[PDB]
Amino acid sequence: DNQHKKIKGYRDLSQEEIDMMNRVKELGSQFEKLIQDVSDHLRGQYNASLHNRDEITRIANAEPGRWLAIGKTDIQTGMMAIIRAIAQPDSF
Amino acid sequence: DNQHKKIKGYRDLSQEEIDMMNRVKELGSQFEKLIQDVSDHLRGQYNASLHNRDEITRIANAEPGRWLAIGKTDIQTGMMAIIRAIAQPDSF
Amino acid sequence: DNQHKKIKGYRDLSQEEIDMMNRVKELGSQFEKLIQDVSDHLRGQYNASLHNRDEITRIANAEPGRWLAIGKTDIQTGMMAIIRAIAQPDSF
Amino acid sequence: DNQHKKIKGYRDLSQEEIDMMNRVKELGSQFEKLIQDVSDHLRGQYNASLHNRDEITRIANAEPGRWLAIGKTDIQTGMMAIIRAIAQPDSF
Amino acid sequence: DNQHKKIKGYRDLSQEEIDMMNRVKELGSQFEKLIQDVSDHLRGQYNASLHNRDEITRIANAEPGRWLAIGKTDIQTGMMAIIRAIAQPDSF
Amino acid sequence: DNQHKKIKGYRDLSQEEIDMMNRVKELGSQFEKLIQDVSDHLRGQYNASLHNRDEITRIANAEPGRWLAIGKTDIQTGMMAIIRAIAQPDSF
């Protein structure tokens, strides 16, 4: 109970602060859907491109999945930073 | 004219691809508004907290603006990665 | 009260989980002290090197403060990631 | 022998500089132990949670190992930056 | 046709701008070759070190491939940033 | 003297290893020149665009210098990672 007070640096937060943190998380959920949609497109692209070695080689050289992964991480890490700015913890 | 064909690795893109790239950019615009809103909150917080050295010191230790900045960069860099996954260029 | 339950994705945490999160934060505090110590060294180095244009130019080309800053951010962002691994939130 | 003088930008270092670089590396070793401990916890959590599909799905959605990995990289990259600030090389 | 005008924020570019963007991409190609060369060295090192458990353990602890991967990503992401600085898009 | 042996994790290196590390550093020097050239272009662009508020606002919204800075850091951090892969230190 009241876990936050047991965590170093965590401070009591206003409703306004929580609302903002929650908004960032909600916008992120919309990004997640987009990321899933891109993944779906890539999977279809690979399937449709089966038997075209030349296109398969192009997809492999492009590395689209790695790039989608790099992006997800970035969106997520960024969300955490905006949330940290709102939360303003007292620890390093 | 047709600048893209003058850029190494850039390839002709489908409408479907452009639509997706544009969607990422549009979602990012929504993040930009949120980022601006957080900045506004922080500015107000500083103003209201003027004359409370203790709170001003807390805000300074928290470094909220640096964190908002780190987040913007991350959201933006990530967007570029998702776009790269959609665009699939032919260059390293 | 019970702010966490008002935040999307946050889940009830065990004492064991909190202890671990707190340990990461404590180790980070030790890094903060080191970072401050390096900053102190750099400041002294600049002072002692005043009137040696050649050394001042060397420090400026090296960009030590930027590098210390890049490191602090990295240590901190990493701490957040380990904490996220321990906390295991239910949101993206 | 004297490899450093064969590496571009590397410069002769004071004992004080080496001591500081070594301290960062030693603190990092303490982080490594923590990272290993978190990994151990996660492995146990997965084992104990075997046969609870609902919990296994929760762990998978959380992606704790990816997050631990992101953190290790960050701690390590940051250490390198602090070390670079201490070492102050003469190369870009 | 004229895909760029269909992409949000993309703007007409001068030849001078394209030339610079292309130069960054060309320099990156040189990095790609180096990265491939390092990978080749690592593969040879592993082969030659087969049957020396002690050396194999050393390579594994070092994690050279992960580090090469982290570097490729960084070089590439950076290239994109320099290109963004040259291109100057009108979107977030 | 023999500083490297005084640094934790640093190991004796082959000429082949040093040559490769040096090559990465040399390629980086070429990137530095490009980065300086882009900076020069941006400065000229700002000068020539003085008295065109509309263009000045465009440059400011674009944030080209921040982006060049993000890129330099990335190129540099990446170089360090490739070098780490070649050097293979024995420390975390």
For chain D, the straight-line distance linking the first and the last C-alpha, in angstroms and rounded, comes to 24
Residues D92 and F29 sit within 8 Å (Cβ to Cβ): yes
Tokens linked to F24: 């990465």
The rounded distance, in Å, linking the Cα atoms of B78 and C18 is 30
B78 in reach of chain A (CB within 8 A): yes
Tokens linked to A73: 């991480």
Buried b vs exposed e over A19-43: b needs ≥16 C-beta within 10 Å?
A: ebbbbbbebbeebeebbeebbebbe
Distance from CA of F85 to the nearest CA of E (A): 4
Strand segments (E) across F1-92: none
* Residue C68 CB coordination number (10 Å): 23
The rounded distance, in Å, linking the Cα atoms of D56 and D61 is 9
Residues C13 and A23 sit within 8 Å (Cβ to Cβ): no
Residues F34 and E23 sit within 8 Å (Cβ to Cβ): yes
Which of these, F2, F7, F3, F1, lies nearest to F91 by C-alpha position?
A: F7
For chain E, the straight-line distance linking the first and the last C-alpha, in angstroms and rounded, comes to 24
Which among B7, B13, B15 has the least Cβ separation from residue E18?
B7
User: In which region does residue A48 sit, left (phi positive, over 0), alpha (psi from -120 to 50) or beta (all else)?
Assistant: alpha
Which among D70, D82, D85 has the least Cβ separation from residue C81?
D70
* Residue E67 CB coordination number (10 Å): 25
E chain contacts of residue F25, beta-carbon cutoff 8 Å: none
The rounded distance, in Å, linking the Cα atoms of B59 and E79 is 35
CA distances from E25 to B31, B89, E58, E77 (A): 29, 11, 35, 12
Experimental technique:
X-ray
Which of these, E85, A20, D73, F66, lies nearest to B72 by C-alpha position?
A: F66
Distance from CA of A54 to the nearest CA of C (A): 36
User: In chain A, what are the domain boundaries?
Assistant: 22-86
Window 26-45 of C, Cβ < 8 Å to A: 26, 28-29, 31-32
Look up residue C28 and give its amino acid: G
The rounded distance, in Å, linking the Cα atoms of B59 and B50 is 11
Which among D20, D37, D78 has the least Cβ separation from residue C71?
D78
Tokens linked to A22: 């929650």
Displacement of CA E62 from its chain's centroid (Å): 21
Tokens linked to B44: 């107000």
Displacement of CA F36 from its chain's centroid (Å): 11
The rounded distance, in Å, linking the Cα atoms of C79 and C68 is 16
The rounded distance, in Å, linking the Cα atoms of B60 and E17 is 40
The rounded distance, in Å, linking the Cα atoms of C18 and C14 is 6
Which of these, F87, F29, F17, C64, lies nearest to D87 by C-alpha position?
A: C64
Q: What is the DSSP letter of F90?
A: S
C chain contacts of residue A2, beta-carbon cutoff 8 Å: 1-2
Residue D68 sits at the vertex; the CA angle it makes with D67 and D73, to the nearest 5 degrees, is 100
Q: Which residue in chain D is spatially nearest to C85 when comparing CA positions? A: D64
Neighbours of chain F (3+ CB pairs under 8 A): D, E
Q: What is the DSSP letter of A6?
A: G
Q: What is the DSSP letter of C18?
A: H
Distance from CA of A64 to the nearest CA of C (A): 21
